Design a protein around this nucleic acid. Structure first.
Ligand SMILES: [Zn+2]
Lengths: 116, 998, 49, 50, 34
RNA sequence: GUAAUCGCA
DNA sequence: ACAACTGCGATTAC
DNA sequence: TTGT
């Protein structure tokens, strides 16, 4: 990846990876995105998540989880529908914010800046 | 994996061809090189093929184009030379030569020139089974086998069995004799072949058998054979089978083969040409190695491997290929569209292909196989009509050399959906329906009927029986045709004209997008290569005209912009920043906008108000009357840059010297020159000035002057010292002038719908007809062209454009919108116009009595016109052909050395030619003196011509020339060189005396 | 090959004994005519021959 | 110039009987295709008729 | 060969048989008229 | 001065 | 063996 | 090639 840059900056992690990230210690905010190739709205959400990852190069961690590969994990996370975003704060005492449906990028920025 | 869910890259063909070449063709060619052993001791040198490694170019593309150098890569392969006396093999790496590299756009840089490799369509090797009916008797059946080299092992059958090969020039040849020579014992032959009764009743070599892998496959297909793909040789079983099929054709059990089918043709890409060039270069290298070994033996020295190999063969071979091959042409960079459309051309004519004259009529027509794979409306107009064509948007080149197209599979399955690039021969055995499914007649939907394609035919069948469906809208067209909005409402004949005229557009000083479009301009501008696309994500920390700084992941990347450069066709290239400072850009987004591109979409013209009415004759035939607003507002202003260069060639007697102080020249000139003999930057120049002044000692004055029509600012001058030619080379001084050209009478304008015209008058805005709004129309067009050339989509475009301009909308419409309903274009156009009329309360935009037509007034008198006229805002382009370029005039200046006739060409200041078809008209009119004057003293008669100027200056009458012209005298001299005499020998009627005229 | 078309909507009345049955080139059944016949298109207000 | 003749979209007037004619033609074509599938007519008759 | 021998060979080897064809009126008219 | 290639109408 | 539209203009390569 |  030295000569050619990667086109996509968001990585598809598994459920064990998310469990280890939440269990461990974090110094940057965490954003979890549940998606499925089939949902139409998700095609847009992915573009906004790409823009947000570009805007936040190393000040925040953005990962995506496929509901088709991990359905039980997504069900245990109380995920009603596909355009769902989980905002994990760095300090582990604060409460996570869950957003559902298409939301503007400015809303995501404000949530990451203030709520997390 | 790609191109099945979106429009593929226009330059992906050259990309994948060059990739496959570098991947496998180099190794395949290096494998077949022979072991050099030419001696009694048999000193043998070898090249380790496994140790093949290319090296990055030493210079960049921006330096290669500037210094007129080639952009190539270094081939280093480890070699081992086993000396005779040393009894050991020393291993070193040698530099064989340079291999040119291809850009991401598909172009290559050789000697500082952008060149593209056009593909070629050649018949695939195989067995063909044609038939020919005799004048009297049964029809003759023949089978031809085609080899890679081009061998023709024909087989024929007469009224009898008579299985006779046509290889020999003689009457015939025995197939049984050929089989026996092949190895058949005359028993297994009859045992294996079918219908042995017919065979028994009847009572160079390497190139013909050099069947390709493709050849093997095809042979297997037509003649069912189980021969493994690997054995690519003409086996006798194949011949036996061929004979069997041939005899079977006589009894009706057969099918003749169509040689215009794509499945029977192969496509040669840049990889195929580069592989053959590399093979020829390797042959030259082996010859040079043998020669240098022979020389080293003569000089009694065992040299290192490096001493043997020279970098000359590879470099000279690739240079000669890029310079002189008929399939290597300079890239057309008149506009961004030309750069992309040039690389999609497929050509029948070429090395090993049908010449213009050779090509039969059949070759030049569409074959049902061309659907979705080749463009049916893009050809080359002229003697090569139907021989040069483009490539479909969604096509790809297959593993077997066949163009493949994407077909959806509606058949029920596990996935239930597929996008397969079916090859030409495979799609024939499928029911391909291009119609929609929006029909119910109180029965199951699968019981509905739809037109479809099967076995190269058209028929109507139920939806249960259709296997495939063509969903992609731009599947059957090319980039040129797809940029035509409302192409369904235009005739197919005018589509070619519009595609050809879109290529001529000139990039303007300012760019504006089109209100009505097809939606392909985005990818066209993306793949054109005149756009700045980021290769890394990050933020734009610094913005400047010359460079753009992009900071990402702790690294800063600098992108250099283009500021008023020059193309190959004298068109300016410039780039402007689109993104502001402090915004994030992904890997792929647009950083800057090049010429003829705004907002990331191709923009080759402007949007101007247009009315379709006759105006005082100024619109007769095709001619346009335009207003002065286009002139004084710089709507169609363009910049053109022309280069002039003279090399300082050093003669053996004396070298050229560049001095500013040159006598025998007036003081009005030479003002622009600097201390050195070159013009200064920012200097306005005109015709007859001196750009570079040279003493030229060998003294004289071989300078550079400006020709007629050259009046522009001197933007930049380059002193180019030439090196790398094995010796001191002449310096090159290149000057560049920029001529700002405005719209003028005599310029050609055009529309995307095939409408073309020449400006005839520039009326003021006050005289122009004005609408009920009060605005004068920018152009007026002739309304009689619509029934003549059958262009109805223009009306639609105009109207939609008016609507958009009022409502501030841009419409990107895919072609064939009538698949949804009937009169979909009409409904859309009328709906948008009504909305415009309601929202901006201009009632005139939609007239309920006559939708799309309004009643305008006359600017001169102020009285309304009787009938309503069409008012719209189409997209008008300005074409490259311009009056200034076409103006020419000669009085008496220069003559050819041998013919002594006036010179040819506009740049050379030559006159016009009086051909045979004009001498015939002059003789029919009866003007003998005019013909005589044109044939003698205006053309060739040196003395008469010399006397003409004197007689005209003095004013005396010009006498009739009596001597023969120089052309006749030449003939006499030539014929007498051919030992043939010619004498005039006129005889006087008065005294009966013969007088010779010399 | 001129094609005769009905001038108006109505019933067709003619004597079938004069015409001979035949099969058209389009696979359809028809009556061959070899002698001058008069057919009447019986409409609401007028008769056509 | 005074009258300023022009051509528009709604100005291309089709005969008022194109729909009926095309409809009866395609109806006869569908009937003939159905009977060809049954076997009452062969291919050349269908081609000639269409 | 002869039609009788060919028909016998068909019946013996290929399983030919003059099965009754229950035609429609239009099909019978087509078979008789052509 | 000749070729190659494209365009033009 | 012979011939198969008329001319014009642009480029690069010798 | 196409035909002469
Ligand atoms: Zn349409």
């Amino acid at each position: 990846g030295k000569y050619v840059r990667e086109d996509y900056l968001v990585k598809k992690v598994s459920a064990k990876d998310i469990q280890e990230l939440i269990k461990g210690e974090r110094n940057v905010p965490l954003i979890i995105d549940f998606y499925a190739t089939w949902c139409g709205p998700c095609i847009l959400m992915a573009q906004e998540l790409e823009m947000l990852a570009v805007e936040y190069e190393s000040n925040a961690l953005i990962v995506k989880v496929d509901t088709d590969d991990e359905y039980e994990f997504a069900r245990d996370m109380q995920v009603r529908g596909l355009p769902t975003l989980y905002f994990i704060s760095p300090d582990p005492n604060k409460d996570a914010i869950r957003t559902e449906g298409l939301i503007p990028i400015q809303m995501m920025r404000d949530i990451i800046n203030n709520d997390l | 994996n790609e191109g099945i869910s979106t429009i593929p890259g226009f330059n992906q063909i050259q990309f994948e061809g060059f990739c496959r070449f570098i991947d496998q063709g180099l190794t395949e060619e290096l494998y077949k090189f022979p072991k050099i052993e030419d001696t009694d001791q048999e000193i043998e040198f070898q090249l380790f093929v496994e140790t093949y490694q290319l090296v990055e170019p030493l210079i960049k593309e921006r330096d290669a184009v500037y210094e007129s150098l080639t952009y190539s890569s270094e081939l280093y392969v480890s070699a081992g030379l086993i000396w005779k006396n040393s009894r050991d093999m020393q291993e070193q790496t040698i530099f064989i030569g340079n291999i040119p590299l291809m850009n991401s756009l598909g172009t290559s840089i050789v000697n500082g020139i952008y060149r593209i490799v056009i593909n070629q369509i050649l018949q695939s090797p195989g067995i063909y089974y044609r038939s020919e009916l005799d004048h009297n008797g049964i029809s003759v059946y023949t089978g031809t086998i085609i080899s890679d080299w081009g061998g023709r092992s024909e087989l024929e059958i007469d009224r009898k069995a008579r299985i006779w090969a046509r290889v020999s020039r003689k009457q015939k040849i025995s197939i049984l004799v050929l089989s026996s020579a092949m190895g058949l014992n005359l028993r297994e032959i009859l045992e294996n072949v079918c219908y042995p009764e017919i065979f028994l009743s009847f009572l160079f070599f390497q190139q013909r058998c050099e069947l390709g892998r493709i050849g093997r496959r095809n042979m297997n297909r037509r003649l069912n054979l189980d021969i493994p793909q690997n054995n690519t040789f003409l086996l006798p079983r194949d011949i036996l089978a061929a004979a069997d099929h041939l005899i079977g054709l006589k009894f009706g059990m057969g099918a003749l083969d169509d040689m215009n089918h794509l499945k029977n043709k192969r496509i040669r890409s840049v990889a195929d040409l580069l592989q053959d060039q590399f093979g020829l270069a390797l042959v030259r290298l082996e010859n040079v190695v043998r020669g240098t070994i022979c020389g080293a033996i003569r000089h009694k020295l065992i040299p290192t491997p490096q001493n043997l190999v020279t970098s000359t063969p590879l470099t000279t071979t690739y240079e000669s290929f890029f310079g002189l091959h008929p399939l290597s042409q300079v890239l057309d960079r008149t506009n961004p569209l030309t750069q992309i459309v040039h690389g999609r051309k497929l050509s029948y004519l070429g090395p090993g292909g049908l010449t213009g004259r050779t090509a039969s009529f059949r070759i030049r027509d569409i074959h049902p196989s061309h659907y979705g794979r080749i463009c049916p409306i893009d050809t080359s107009e002229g003697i090569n009509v139907g021989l040069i064509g483009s490539l479909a948007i969604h096509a790809r080149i297959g593993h077997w050399g066949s163009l493949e197209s994407p077909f959806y599979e509606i058949s029920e399955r596990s996935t239930g959906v597929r996008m397969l690039y079916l090859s030409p021969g495979r799609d024939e055995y499928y029911m391909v329906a291009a119609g929609n499914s929006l029909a119910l007649n109180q029965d199951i939907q699968e019981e509905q009927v739809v037109p479809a394609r099967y076995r190269q035919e058209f028929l109507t069948i139920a939806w249960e029986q259709v296997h495939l469906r063509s969903i992609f809208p731009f599947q059957y067209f090319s980039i040129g045709a797809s940029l035509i909005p409302f192409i369904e409402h235009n005739d197919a004949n005018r589509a070619l004209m519009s595609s050809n005229m879109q290529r001529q557009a000139v990039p303007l000083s300012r760019s504006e997008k089109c209100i009505v479009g097809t939606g392909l301009e985005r990818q066209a501008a993306l793949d054109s290569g005149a756009l700045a696309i980021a290769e890394r994500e990050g933020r734009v920390v610094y913005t400047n005209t010359d460079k753009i700084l992009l900071a990402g992941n702790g690294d800063i990347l600098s992108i250099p912009l283009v500021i008023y450069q020059r193309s190959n066709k004298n068109t300016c290239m410039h780039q402007k920043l689109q993104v502001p400072r402090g915004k994030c850009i992904k890997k792929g987004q647009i950083l800057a906008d090049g010429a003829a591109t705004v907002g990331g979409e191709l923009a080759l013209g402007k949007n101007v108000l247009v009315a379709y009415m006759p105006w005082e004759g100024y619109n007769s035939e095709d001619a346009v009357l335009i207003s002065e607003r286009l002139v004084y507002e710089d709507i169609y202003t363009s910049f053109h840059i022309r280069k002039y260069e003279i090399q300082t060639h050093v003669t053996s007697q004396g070298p050229e010297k560049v001095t500013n102080e040159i006598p025998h020249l007036e003081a009005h000139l030479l003002r622009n020159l600097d201390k050195n003999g070159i013009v200064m930057l920012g200097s306005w120049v005109e015709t007859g000035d001196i750009l570079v002044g040279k003493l030229t000692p060998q003294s004289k004055e071989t300078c550079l002057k400006l020709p007629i029509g050259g009046r522009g600012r001197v933007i930049d001058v380059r002193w180019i010292q030439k090196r790398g030619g094995s010796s001191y080379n002449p310096e090159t001084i290149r000057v560049y002038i920029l001529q700002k050209r405005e719209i003028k009478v005599g310029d050609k304008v055009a529309g995307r719908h095939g409408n073309k015209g020449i400006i005839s008058k520039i009326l003021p805005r006050q005289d122009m007809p004005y609408l009920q709004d009060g605005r004068s129309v920018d152009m007026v067009f002739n309304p009689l062209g619509v029934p003549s050339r059958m262009n109805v989509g223009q009306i639609f475009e105009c109207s939609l454009g008016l609507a958009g301009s009022l409502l501030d909308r841009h419409y990107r419409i895919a072609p064939f919108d009538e698949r949804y309903e009937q009169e979909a274009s009409r409904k859309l156009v009328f709906s948008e116009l009504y909305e415009a009329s309601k929202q901006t309360a201009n009632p005139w935009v939609f007239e309920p009595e006559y939708p799309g037509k309004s009643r305008i007034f006359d600017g001169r008198t102020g009285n309304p016109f009787e009938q309503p006229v069409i008012i719209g805002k189409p997209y008008i382009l300005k074409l490259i052909h311009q009056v200034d370029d076409k103006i020419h005039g000669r009085s008496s200046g220069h003559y050819a050395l041998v013919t002594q006739q006036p010179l040819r060409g506009r740049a050379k200041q030559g006159g016009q030619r009086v051909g045979e078809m004009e001498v015939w008209a002059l003789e029919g009119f009866g003007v003998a003196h005019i013909l005589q004057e044109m044939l003698t003293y205006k053309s060739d008669h040196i003395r008469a011509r010399q006397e003409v100027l004197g007689t005209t200056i003095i004013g005396g009458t010009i006498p009739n020339p009596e001597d023969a012209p120089e052309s006749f005298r030449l003939l006499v001299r030539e014929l007498r060189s051919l030992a043939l005499e010619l004498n005039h020998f006129l005889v006087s009627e008065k005294n009966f005396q013969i007088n010779r005229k010399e | 090959a001129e094609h005769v078309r009905a001038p108006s909507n109505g019933k067709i009345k003619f004597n079938e004994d004069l015409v001979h049955p035949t099969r058209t080139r389009h696979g359809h059944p028809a009556f061959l005519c070899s002698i001058d016949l008069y057919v009447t298109i019986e409409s609401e207000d007028i008769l056509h021959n | 110039t005074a009258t300023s003749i022009s051509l528009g979209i709604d100005d291309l007037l089709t005969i008022p009987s194109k729909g009926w004619l095309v409809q009866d033609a395609e109806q006869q074509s569908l009937i003939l295709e159905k009977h060809h599938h049954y076997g009452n007519v062969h291919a050349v008759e269908k081609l000639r008729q269409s | 060969e002869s039609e009788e021998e060919a028909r016998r060979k068909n019946w013996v080897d290929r399983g030919w048989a003059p099965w009754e064809e229950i035609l429609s009126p239009e099909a019978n008219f087509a078979r008789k008229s052509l």
